[PDB]
Design an enzyme around this catalytic site. Structure first.
Site, PDB file in Angstrom:
ATOM      1  N   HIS A  92       0.817  -1.198   0.000  1.00  0.00           N
ATOM      2  CA  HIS A  92       0.000   0.000   0.000  1.00  0.00           C
ATOM      3  C   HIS A  92       0.858   1.258   0.000  1.00  0.00           C
ATOM      4  O   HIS A  92       2.105   1.211   0.165  1.00  0.00           O
ATOM      5  CB  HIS A  92      -0.935   0.009   1.252  1.00  0.00           C
ATOM      6  CG  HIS A  92      -0.278   0.053   2.631  1.00  0.00           C
ATOM      7  ND1 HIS A  92      -0.195  -1.085   3.447  1.00  0.00           N
ATOM      8  CD2 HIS A  92       0.267   1.097   3.329  1.00  0.00           C
ATOM      9  CE1 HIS A  92       0.400  -0.684   4.605  1.00  0.00           C
ATOM     10  NE2 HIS A  92       0.686   0.606   4.559  1.00  0.00           N
ATOM     11  N   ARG A 104      -1.845  10.991   4.495  1.00  0.00           N
ATOM     12  CA  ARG A 104      -2.530  11.583   5.638  1.00  0.00           C
ATOM     13  C   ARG A 104      -3.613  12.478   5.074  1.00  0.00           C
ATOM     14  O   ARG A 104      -3.352  13.240   4.122  1.00  0.00           O
ATOM     15  CB  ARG A 104      -1.563  12.354   6.548  1.00  0.00           C
ATOM     16  CG  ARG A 104      -0.603  11.417   7.257  1.00  0.00           C
ATOM     17  CD  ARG A 104       0.348  12.225   8.140  1.00  0.00           C
ATOM     18  NE  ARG A 104       1.404  11.374   8.661  1.00  0.00           N
ATOM     19  CZ  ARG A 104       2.569  11.180   8.039  1.00  0.00           C
ATOM     20  NH1 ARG A 104       2.886  11.785   6.895  1.00  0.00           N
ATOM     21  NH2 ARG A 104       3.414  10.343   8.600  1.00  0.00           N
ATOM     22  N   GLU A 153      -3.775   3.405   2.145  1.00  0.00           N
ATOM     23  CA  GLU A 153      -4.002   3.550   3.591  1.00  0.00           C
ATOM     24  C   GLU A 153      -4.215   5.028   3.858  1.00  0.00           C
ATOM     25  O   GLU A 153      -3.365   5.877   3.565  1.00  0.00           O
ATOM     26  CB  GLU A 153      -2.799   3.057   4.400  1.00  0.00           C
ATOM     27  CG  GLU A 153      -2.920   3.283   5.910  1.00  0.00           C
ATOM     28  CD  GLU A 153      -1.691   2.753   6.598  1.00  0.00           C
ATOM     29  OE1 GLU A 153      -0.716   2.403   5.983  1.00  0.00           O
ATOM     30  OE2 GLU A 153      -1.756   2.712   7.904  1.00  0.00           O
ATOM     31  N   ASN A 168      -5.356  11.957  11.835  1.00  0.00           N
ATOM     32  CA  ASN A 168      -4.862  12.277  13.164  1.00  0.00           C
ATOM     33  C   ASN A 168      -5.906  13.193  13.790  1.00  0.00           C
ATOM     34  O   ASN A 168      -6.228  14.264  13.274  1.00  0.00           O
ATOM     35  CB  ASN A 168      -3.465  12.956  13.096  1.00  0.00           C
ATOM     36  CG  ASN A 168      -2.368  11.940  12.836  1.00  0.00           C
ATOM     37  OD1 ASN A 168      -2.051  11.122  13.702  1.00  0.00           O
ATOM     38  ND2 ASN A 168      -1.779  11.972  11.637  1.00  0.00           N
ATOM     39  N   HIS A 173       2.203  11.479  -7.093  1.00  0.00           N
ATOM     40  CA  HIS A 173       0.822  11.063  -7.183  1.00  0.00           C
ATOM     41  C   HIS A 173       0.679   9.575  -7.132  1.00  0.00           C
ATOM     42  O   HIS A 173       1.647   8.811  -7.048  1.00  0.00           O
ATOM     43  CB  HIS A 173       0.332  11.500  -8.602  1.00  0.00           C
ATOM     44  CG  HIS A 173       1.116  10.886  -9.770  1.00  0.00           C
ATOM     45  ND1 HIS A 173       1.983  11.651 -10.528  1.00  0.00           N
ATOM     46  CD2 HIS A 173       1.089   9.636 -10.328  1.00  0.00           C
ATOM     47  CE1 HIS A 173       2.438  10.846 -11.513  1.00  0.00           C
ATOM     48  NE2 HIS A 173       1.952   9.629 -11.413  1.00  0.00           N
ATOM     49  N   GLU A 217      -3.528  10.383 -11.016  1.00  0.00           N
ATOM     50  CA  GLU A 217      -3.444  10.194 -12.451  1.00  0.00           C
ATOM     51  C   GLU A 217      -4.400   9.083 -12.822  1.00  0.00           C
ATOM     52  O   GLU A 217      -4.372   8.000 -12.223  1.00  0.00           O
ATOM     53  CB  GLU A 217      -2.012   9.757 -12.816  1.00  0.00           C
ATOM     54  CG  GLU A 217      -1.821   9.563 -14.336  1.00  0.00           C
ATOM     55  CD  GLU A 217      -0.381   9.202 -14.554  1.00  0.00           C
ATOM     56  OE1 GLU A 217       0.351   8.900 -13.621  1.00  0.00           O
ATOM     57  OE2 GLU A 217       0.001   9.202 -15.790  1.00  0.00           O
TER      58      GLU A 217
HETATM   59 NI    NI Z   1       2.446   8.539 -13.226  1.00  0.00          NI
HETATM   60 NI    NI Z   2       1.175   1.422   6.355  1.00  0.00          NI
END
Ligand code: NI
Ligand code: NI
Lengths: 128, 128
Positions: free
Chosen positions: A5, A9, A56, A60, A74, A122
Site C-alpha cells: 500500500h 494523511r 491507507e 490524526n 501522485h 493520475e
Molecule cells: Ni504517473
Molecule cells: Ni502502512
C-alpha cells in the site's frame, strides 16, 4: 515480495473514504482507531489486500491540514472511463487538473485530478 | 480498476534505482526521458506494470532536492526477513527509523526505514 500500500494523511477521514469509494469506485476494506495515539485509519482499494496494493488513509484527531511538499508526486489508477470520472469528480466538487484525453505523442486516454486534500491522482484508461 | 503506481520525485535517478533494485529486490521495468519537460523516469517493481502496482521514480533534470512535507506517509512492502532487510538498507544508502519488531499488542513483525531521499518505507514481514 510485493508492494502492499501507499499511505496518505488526510484532513477528514470520512470525506476521503466517501471520495475513494463513491467517486473512484473503490471499496472500504477495513478501518481502525488508535486511541492511545489519537488517530484513525482506513484502507480503500479495488481488491483484497492479500492480492493487491491499496491505499491507507490516516486521520490524526484534530488535524485538518498538512504541508504537501514538493517531493510526493501522485498515485495512478486504471480508470474504466476517464471522461466520466472527470465528470463525477468535478460535480462532486473536486478539481480536474488535466481533462481526459490522449497523452502527448500517444493514444492512451489519461486525466489528472485532485482528491479532497489536494493530492494528485493520475487516471489511465487502459497472461491473458 | 487497479492501483498502477505511486510517483515520487528523487534527487538522483541512479541512486534511487540502485536502492530499489539492489537493496529492495525490485527490478527496473522501464525508463524514459523527455526533453520538452526536462525529466527522466524509472519504473521499478516486484512485477510488471500489468500485474502489479509499482513505483514511478521521477528525476527532474538539475533538481536534486525537494521538500518532503508532512502529508505523504509511506509505501509498504512485504519482506521475508525484516531484520535482514533493515541491515541491508541501513548499510546501502538508507536509514532505519524504527527497528524491526512486532506491533504493540500484535505479533506481526514490522519496521520503518527511509530511502536515499528521505521517503519512508514500511516493511511488513510475512521454530527459530
Ligand atoms: Ni504517473
Ligand atoms: Ni502502512
Amino acid at each position: 515480495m510485493r508492494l502492499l500500500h501507499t499511505m496518505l494523511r488526510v484532513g477528514d477521514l470520512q470525506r476521503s473514504i466517501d471520495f475513494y469509494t463513491k467517486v473512484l469506485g473503490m471499496k472500504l476494506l477495513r478501518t481502525s482507531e488508535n486511541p492511545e495515539y489519537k488517530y484513525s485509519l482506513a484502507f480503500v482499494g479495488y481488491g483484497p489486500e492479500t492480492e493487491e496494493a491499496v491505499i491507507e488513509l490516516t486521520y490524526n484527531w484534530g488535524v485538518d491540514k498538512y504541508e504537501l511538499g514538493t517531493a510526493y508526486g501522485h498515485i495512478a489508477l486504471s480508470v474504466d472511463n476517464a471522461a466520466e470520472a472527470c465528470e463525477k469528480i468535478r460535480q462532486n466538487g473536486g478539481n480536474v487538473t488535466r481533462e481526459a484525453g490522449p497523452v502527448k505523442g500517444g493514444t492512451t486516454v489519461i486525466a489528472f485530478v485532485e482528491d479532497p486534500d489536494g493530492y494528485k491522482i493520475e487516471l489511465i484508461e487502459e497472461g491473458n
